[PDB]
Amino acid sequence: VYAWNRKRISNCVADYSVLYNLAPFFTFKCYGVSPTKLNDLCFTNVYADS
């Protein structure tokens, strides 16, 4: 929580299916979107952070 490893993704066909078969308890909780319709849309720039 002291350093944010922010890494934006570039132009690609991001398939939201690898996160399904992730580590145990792979809950896909969202706060404004829905995972059911979070794979059929395009994104300007997605920012990742661990």
Binding site: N11, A14, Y16, N45, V46, A48, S50
Partner: protein, 49 residues
């Protein structure tokens, strides 16, 4: 190695997206069809439904 569940570590990754009408680059896996010129149809150009 055997810490209590109340104080176990959690690896959490958030994916903040930009849900805007800007020209997007990170699209989802889908298919593509042909284009009609003078036929009223349902379009989904770059997310715009």
């Amino acid at each position: 190695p055997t810490y209590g569940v109340g104080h176990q570590p959690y690896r959490v990754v958030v994916l903040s997206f930009e849900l805007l009408h800007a020209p997007a680059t990170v699209c989802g896996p889908k298919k593509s069809t042909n284009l009609v010129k003078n036929k009223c149809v349902n379009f989904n150009f770059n997310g715009l439904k």
